[PDB]
Design a binder for this molecule. Sequence first.
Ligand SMILES: CO[C@H]1O[C@H](COS(=O)(=O)O)[C@@H](O[C@@H]2O[C@@H](C(=O)O)[C@@H](O[C@H]3O[C@H](COS(=O)(=O)O)[C@@H](O[C@@H]4O[C@H](C(=O)O)[C@@H](O[C@H]5O[C@H](COS(=O)(=O)O)[C@@H](O)[C@H](O)[C@H]5NS(=O)(=O)O)[C@H](O)[C@H]4O)[C@H](OS(=O)(=O)O)[C@H]3NS(=O)(=O)O)[C@H](O)[C@H]2OS(=O)(=O)O)[C@H](O)[C@H]1NS(=O)(=O)O
Ligand SMILES: CO[C@H]1O[C@H](COS(=O)(=O)O)[C@@H](O[C@@H]2O[C@@H](C(=O)O)[C@@H](O[C@H]3O[C@H](COS(=O)(=O)O)[C@@H](O[C@@H]4O[C@H](C(=O)O)[C@@H](O[C@H]5O[C@H](COS(=O)(=O)O)[C@@H](O)[C@H](O)[C@H]5NS(=O)(=O)O)[C@H](O)[C@H]4O)[C@H](OS(=O)(=O)O)[C@H]3NS(=O)(=O)O)[C@H](O)[C@H]2OS(=O)(=O)O)[C@H](O)[C@H]1NS(=O)(=O)O
Ligand SMILES: *[C@@H]1O[C@H](CO)[C@@H](O[C@@H]2O[C@H](CO)[C@@H](O[C@@H]3O[C@H](CO[C@H]4O[C@H](CO)[C@@H](O)[C@H](O)[C@@H]4O)[C@@H](O)[C@H](O[C@H]4O[C@H](CO)[C@@H](O)[C@H](O)[C@@H]4O)[C@@H]3O)[C@H](O)[C@H]2NC(C)=O)[C@H](O)[C@H]1NC(C)=O
Ligand SMILES: *[C@@H]1O[C@H](CO)[C@@H](O[C@@H]2O[C@H](CO)[C@@H](O)[C@H](O)[C@H]2NC(C)=O)[C@H](O)[C@H]1NC(C)=O
Ligand SMILES: *[C@@H]1O[C@H](CO)[C@@H](O[C@@H]2O[C@H](CO)[C@@H](O)[C@H](O)[C@H]2NC(C)=O)[C@H](O)[C@H]1NC(C)=O
Ligand SMILES: *[C@@H]1O[C@H](CO)[C@@H](O)[C@H](O)[C@H]1NC(C)=O
Ligand SMILES: *[C@@H]1O[C@H](CO)[C@@H](O)[C@H](O)[C@H]1NC(C)=O
Lengths: 404, 417
Amino acid sequence: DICTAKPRDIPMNPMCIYRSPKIPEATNRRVWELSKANSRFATTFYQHLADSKNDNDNIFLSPLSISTAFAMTKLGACNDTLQQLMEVFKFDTISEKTSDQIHFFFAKLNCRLYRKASSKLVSANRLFGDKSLTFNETYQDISELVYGAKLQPLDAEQSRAAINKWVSNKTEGRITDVIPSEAINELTVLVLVNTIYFKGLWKSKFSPENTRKELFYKADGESCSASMMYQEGKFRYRRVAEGTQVLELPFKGDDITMVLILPKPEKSLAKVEKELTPEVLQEWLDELEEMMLVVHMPRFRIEDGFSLKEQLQDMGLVDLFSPEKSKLPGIVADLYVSDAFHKAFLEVNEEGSEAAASTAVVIAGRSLNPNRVTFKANRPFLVFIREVPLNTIIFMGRVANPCV
Amino acid sequence: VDICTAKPRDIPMNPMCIYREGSEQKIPEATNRRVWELSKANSRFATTFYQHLADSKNDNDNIFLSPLSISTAFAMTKLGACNDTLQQLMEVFKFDTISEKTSDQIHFFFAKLNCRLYRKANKSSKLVSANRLFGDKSLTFNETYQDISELVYGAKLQPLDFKENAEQSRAAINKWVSNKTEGRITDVIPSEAINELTVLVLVNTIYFKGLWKSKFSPENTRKELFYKADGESCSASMMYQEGKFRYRRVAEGTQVLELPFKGDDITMVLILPKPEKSLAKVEKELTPEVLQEWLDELEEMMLVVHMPRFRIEDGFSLKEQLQDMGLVDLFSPEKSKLPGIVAEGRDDLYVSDAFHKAFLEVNEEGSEAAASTAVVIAGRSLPNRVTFKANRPFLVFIREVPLNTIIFMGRVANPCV
Ligand SMILES: CO[C@H]1O[C@H](COS(=O)(=O)O)[C@@H](O[C@@H]2O[C@@H](C(=O)O)[C@@H](O[C@H]3O[C@H](COS(=O)(=O)O)[C@@H](O[C@@H]4O[C@H](C(=O)O)[C@@H](O[C@H]5O[C@H](COS(=O)(=O)O)[C@@H](O)[C@H](O)[C@H]5NS(=O)(=O)O)[C@H](O)[C@H]4O)[C@H](OS(=O)(=O)O)[C@H]3NS(=O)(=O)O)[C@H](O)[C@H]2OS(=O)(=O)O)[C@H](O)[C@H]1NS(=O)(=O)O
Ligand SMILES: CO[C@H]1O[C@H](COS(=O)(=O)O)[C@@H](O[C@@H]2O[C@@H](C(=O)O)[C@@H](O[C@H]3O[C@H](COS(=O)(=O)O)[C@@H](O[C@@H]4O[C@H](C(=O)O)[C@@H](O[C@H]5O[C@H](COS(=O)(=O)O)[C@@H](O)[C@H](O)[C@H]5NS(=O)(=O)O)[C@H](O)[C@H]4O)[C@H](OS(=O)(=O)O)[C@H]3NS(=O)(=O)O)[C@H](O)[C@H]2OS(=O)(=O)O)[C@H](O)[C@H]1NS(=O)(=O)O
Ligand SMILES: *[C@@H]1O[C@H](CO)[C@@H](O[C@@H]2O[C@H](CO)[C@@H](O[C@@H]3O[C@H](CO[C@H]4O[C@H](CO)[C@@H](O)[C@H](O)[C@@H]4O)[C@@H](O)[C@H](O[C@H]4O[C@H](CO)[C@@H](O)[C@H](O)[C@@H]4O)[C@@H]3O)[C@H](O)[C@H]2NC(C)=O)[C@H](O)[C@H]1NC(C)=O
Ligand SMILES: *[C@@H]1O[C@H](CO)[C@@H](O[C@@H]2O[C@H](CO)[C@@H](O)[C@H](O)[C@H]2NC(C)=O)[C@H](O)[C@H]1NC(C)=O
Ligand SMILES: *[C@@H]1O[C@H](CO)[C@@H](O[C@@H]2O[C@H](CO)[C@@H](O)[C@H](O)[C@H]2NC(C)=O)[C@H](O)[C@H]1NC(C)=O
Ligand SMILES: *[C@@H]1O[C@H](CO)[C@@H](O)[C@H](O)[C@H]1NC(C)=O
Ligand SMILES: *[C@@H]1O[C@H](CO)[C@@H](O)[C@H](O)[C@H]1NC(C)=O
């Protein structure tokens, strides 16, 4: 059991260790620390990601999800491979204890972010290794005990089937064909596979009988047709520094919410992206205050699938992806990382996330003031899916083009 | 005798003057075909009168009344109606649009009608009525006029000294309506409307109060500002609820919701028009068929509901309006003809005027409402009341399920409570 056990009860330290030469109610000191650390990686990682993608391309990912994945291997990692892992993911800017049993506190942080009832948050993670080699039987245990499962041996394309089809089972169709038909080969050593997507309803719904057909202005200069939803009501909003508009739409339960961030018309979304930093992010989330504004927002489905390899290495995570430089004796009873794949899906509309249903919403007596605030997202804006009251960034993406 | 369990061949009511494809059947279980028919033809006056009322008000003003009550009252008056005065009565109140066996006994079935609508049931949903005739302490009224009146409407003839004390007696009437309306309806008859020439006054009352089948939780109620047309703003207590309710996104993008009271025999029907479309557009499209149509269609559903916690009142002379429709002879010291009321003591009487008043209340616990109609014979002949201009209004109905009888109907424009 992970939700409430205790480390003292299940000795689970790594083979190698590393040494780099506003407390909320009923919250574990560590789990909090570890969490703030992830939000400092998520923003940096998002920048590099953004920077490398065209300005019309949508984005979506669960940074928390990637952090966890790599946080595993940093269990059998050693030397330069361990240093780069540690330095990159910000794992080094946290206490010694939390860092040694990092993998554990992560599981602990999950049990909670998931104990968030109501709307369900499905995920599907596993490490697939080749049968040729033999793995530590304890690595496997601390894995099945903390990372949901054990590195599943494999081999060689009925493998792509095994994988993609393994995710099929868990994501029940939602996530499929995870890896392409050109990832495995005469060099298919070790591969990471992590996928996720969120399922939830809006605390305060939108009404289908109010969805017009507005125009959306894309990054190049053109414009296109989008399904613009509409709604009148109370919301946590705030005109932050330089105009940038921040708006928070919560899901039922009030412990998970979607923060939207729309820049002015003159300032490109790209400019806003180059300023994200934990401090500036929370701060915006502090100036929020309730009001009665209108809300316009296009529907959209977003399915991002990519290799973290090129992006991480471009960040300094090079040894892990090197046959002659790697160092993961912590799983073998050497070996190296071939490629790691991530996948997130996110669909939105009148009802919420992934939530498919037809409801009605009648409001009699409401008459807002002509001098009202309106949030018309007819242009590129960022999106967050944070958890409360922890402020954990679960998904963070960008909607550059909802049309099509 | 017992009207409620008697037939037209057991207590044949004799007045003084008698008169005279496409009637598409959608009648339910335990329902008499002519009772339904009357109600429908009642509802027909209900919608045609509303349009004339509204059409004479600023579109941001409230409107509330009991069309049922206004019909009962005049039906009670028809007893003594007799020639042209009688034809315009039967026509204006949409009585000439039904079968001969009904268009020749409107009282009997009306009685039956009241029997159904008023039979003491579901203690968690009160709905009563009271009728009363008010006559001059010095006159021999027609003996059979008094009888039919107490039989079919259960309306006794209480004598008051009009000739000398018109106000003392005015307060006696308004005080009566008051008791029958749990105190909600006061001073139905304005002032100086009753003078020393006044012969008879016919009054009718209706009262209601019922809990919501599915309450609202005061815990989730919040206050929000409301902006009127003049630019002024006031506070509102918006209620919220999530659950199973009969709904239907009728044409034009016009919603139509129903909220039932404990006993499922009576319910409220809210009608909100498209966020940015006319509401007058609908008011002029309103007809019994349209209501039935929309209501039969309503399919259950899971929806969220945001409606206020308000109160509203209307008071006004039916005169100007009923004449617009054709009720002329009755209001004329010369053409009027009501010879069945007085035996001796007073030369032909006319209707100086008629008044109505209504009250409606709503909240998490449920709803209450009341209404009265008063017809004064030979009194002072004269008018204007509260004229508050609001903003963004929606319609409201309170009906009796078994056969769609409109007990109350109107337009809420100022939820500001
Ligand atoms: C350089 O020294 C470094 O290492 C030494 C030794 O490390 S070793 O253990 O690997 O050998 C470290 O010393 C050791 O660490 C101690 C410590 O963590 O402070 C201590 O850990 C054990 O005892 C802790 C205190 O227990 S308590 O009884 O005093 O509370 C305990 O910490 C508490 O855990 C609970 C918990 O897990 O629930 C926390 O509860 C809080 O959050 C809950 C919800 O959690 S959730 O994740 O948000 O969902 C809420 O339900 C709860 O209400 C809330 N409590 S509240 O008061 O805020 O409301 C509680 O906050 C914590 O204080 C440790 O649990 S643990 O999960 O954090 O590990 C527990 N771990 S255990 O050892 O397995 O039992 C060790 O006893 C201690 O060993 S020692 O020999 O005594 O020194 C040293 O700290 C470390 N320094 S450092 O690395 O630089 O930081
Ligand atoms: C020119 O033709 C026209 O005039 C002639 C003559 O009219 S006259 O009477 O003025 O002279 C009309 O012919 C006469 O009318 C007949 C008729 O009503 O159709 C018929 O009426 C008598 O018999 C009817 C049928 O009885 S039954 O045995 O078949 O049931 C009867 O109608 C029934 O009344 C009951 C009732 O009141 O209980 C109804 O019950 C139904 O509803 C009840 C609840 O009612 S409520 O008010 O909504 O609460 C439920 O409790 C009950 O369960 C339910 N019945 S159920 O089966 O669905 O469950 C029942 O539905 C009716 O059918 C007459 O009662 S009455 O109140 O309607 O008057 C009864 N009246 S009686 O004359 O006193 O006996 C006459 O027999 C007939 O005369 S005749 O010479 O025999 O033909 C002619 O119809 C008319 N044509 S029209 O003007 O164009 O329409
Ligand atoms: C609308 O409805 C109300 C009631 O529903 C009517 O008002 C009632 O009027 C009657 C008669 O006027 C009242 O009855 C009187 O009760 C007296 C004692 O009751 C009071 O005593 C204490 C006060 O602390 C309380 O326990 C109790 O609730 C009452 O407050 C009797 O003493 C009276 O009897 C005699 O009085 C003198 C005798 O000297 C005579 O003039 C009388 O004829 C009689 O012999 C009397 O019975 C009744 O209390 C009133 N209702 C209430 C409870 O307030 C309205 O009249 C009606 N509207 C109309 C006019 O239609
Ligand atoms: C995915 O694999 C799991 C194996 O754990 C299957 O789950 C079982 O499904 C059957 C019905 O086919 C149930 O009776 C069992 O309760 C499930 N759990 C177990 C432990 O057997 C599942 O069927 C596979 N495929 C999908 C898409 O569900
Ligand atoms: C009171 O009204 C009745 C009529 O409703 C008059 O009495 C008779 O009523 C029958 C039944 O309608 C009629 O056919 C007769 O024409 C009426 N007159 C008579 C006696 O045959 C009665 O006249 C009225 N009272 C007064 C004094 O006018
Ligand atoms: C890497 O660092 C470890 C110390 O953790 C050291 O023992 C080892 O020799 C170094 N080189 C390799 C490739 O392991
Ligand atoms: C009024 O109607 C009766 C029949 O009801 C008729 O005999 C009488 O002549 C009529 N009088 C008038 C006003 O012409």
